[PDB]
Design a protein around this ligand. Sequence first.
Ligand code: YAJ
Ligand code: MG
Length: 725
Amino acid sequence: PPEVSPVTGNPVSPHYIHSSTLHFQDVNGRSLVLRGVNLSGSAKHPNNQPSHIREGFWETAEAGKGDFINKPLNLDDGSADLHLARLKAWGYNLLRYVFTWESLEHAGPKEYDYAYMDYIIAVLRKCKEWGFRVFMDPHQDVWSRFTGGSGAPLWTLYACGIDPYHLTATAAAYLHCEWPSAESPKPQDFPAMIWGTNYTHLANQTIWTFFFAGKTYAPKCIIDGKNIQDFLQDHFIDAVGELAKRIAEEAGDLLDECVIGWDSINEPGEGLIGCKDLAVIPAEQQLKKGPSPTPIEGMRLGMGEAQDVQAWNFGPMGPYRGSRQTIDPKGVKLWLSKEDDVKRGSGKWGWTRGKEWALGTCIWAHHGVWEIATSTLLRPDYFSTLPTNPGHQVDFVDDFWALHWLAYSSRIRLHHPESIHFIQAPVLRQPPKLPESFLKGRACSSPHFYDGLTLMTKHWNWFNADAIGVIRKKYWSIVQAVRIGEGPIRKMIQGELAVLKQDTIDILGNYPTLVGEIGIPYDMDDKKAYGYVDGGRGEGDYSSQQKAMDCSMNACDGPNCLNYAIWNYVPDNVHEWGDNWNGEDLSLWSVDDKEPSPSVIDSGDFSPTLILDGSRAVAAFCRPYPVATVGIPERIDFDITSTKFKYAVRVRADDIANEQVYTEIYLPFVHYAASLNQLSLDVTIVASHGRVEIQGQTLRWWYPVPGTGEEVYTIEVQRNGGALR
Ligand SMILES: CN1C[C@H](NC(=O)Cc2ccc3c(c2)NC(=O)CO3)C[C@H]1CO
Ligand SMILES: [Mg+2]
């Protein structure tokens, strides 16, 4: 690695993690692997406002409030250190830190919650004191909580001319708090993983088109003298930059040593950009479930007109058409009236709206996309090209997302000069070619991956299918994408993670890859493992959950040897409501599943209750792996049943190896302890070269580099006497 930064040309801190090659590297040239969790989804919503509670949901946000203090970690009751000790004891060295635009700018435009950013600083310092590397996640889901997920403050909806209280009657967004109606909600009946379909309902279809391309498809949406595009992007970027600046000015010791970089905006929605025909839902749209209006059908509903729409079920091979369904808004419109914009919109939050921004009527009709009098669609391919140049067919990633990233990454570097750009292309899209003028040899691909079949069906199936192959039309038929049996399924999923690596080197360059999100649902089979069904039979049996996560985790091993962050870790998770967000339940830990310095955790002299009590399928997500390596990682293999761990390293004659520069491997007590009834490893170790040493949950491996060329060394570990109970 170089002696100066490829971004600034200055010398680097000793803690610097290089991100200019296919692997993270410390200053001694050791390849680093960073593995951990997202902390935390609990930060998606304010205190006492879980997704399923409607009381106070709208009122507090209307008053400009947004109390996220002590999320994700309560710094007042001493629980924060225990949680971090548990994560560190599981061997994690990485945290994807979750924060929302709402939590920063809920009071109003440019009225930032500086107390909450100080809280974030206070949490990040504990993380630094516990030895975690962190990168920051500006997080959202289907734009905002008020459109069915998480992210942006309520006032952005009014800024877009939308009356939040008409979203349900229009079916422009499905809110857990208001399912099936705002009058008689039954949050527990909220269909599984339906919240994601909000991306293909009118509110998100509109707002995301504004955000990434307002100047192109909505040129008459002027707000404060700017197109809504700049209004929204400036305000989102300014907010995140305001947090980075604060950290830079008030806690600069965090930068690079702990906070190594910033993720791009989370899973950005595409809106209607690229829609080839507003009259149909393309067969390529992979996710359909429940009532699924086409774009024009949703717009007609947005004007209060009843529509008979197709409903979709999710079957073993993906969505398929069920029965048709009639949505009747009974005349209720989605669009804020002029009167309400004065009382609740522009006049309340403090902006001026342009004369040509028609209110109380559909904004796409106002731009000639369809005619309201006849309810007829006029320009079905309007988002397919540029109105100014119909010859150019749009690519959302290249033409709109990339331009946003350019402005976003610039701000990040402005306040965090040595920041790694963790590049998150839109879900299941390849990243764009980005200019080295902006990457500057300090970037990492941060794609997400989920076992999609397992996540939608909340079941570990005896079959599975190659999602990425289907998207890339690899197979003549979707049936040829199916695999049967653990082996084939695991090999298939490992091959899917390999595509993420291929995307990086082919497109971005010789940079590392890190799976920013990966995980499996624990609320499987109607919560049999929580004891909810079959007269309580199966309570505590996480066999299916353990196999699903073991398969996802194994996919990051093999030849991939990937960095990743598991989704997720929710201190306030419970069996009844899961993660308290849209019925998702992906937490590794729950108080409902229960029956201290850093130095003591490094010592291994802690109680086994810390690493097991409250965990779910801990055998799958707490695994051996090499934190730092002299050379390049070539292959990781770990087997729960036998506890057998095998790691191959490609060592090169030019690599640096000596007494203080060695390979370090985490060996979890969970799999290798003598007993879990001090704690100690009870293992047999076989190394092709060099010597080894054991203390706590840490294995140190000294070996010499080859005299010339490169050779592959191996180390094998296995618990004495089989696996634990
Ligand atoms: C657990 N929830 C799930 C949700 N995010 C997504 O669903 C996006 C996604 C990414 C990668 C994927 C697929 C989907 N689908 C595939 O089939 C394989 O790769 C948000 C997250 C936390 O709240
Ligand atoms: Mg103002």
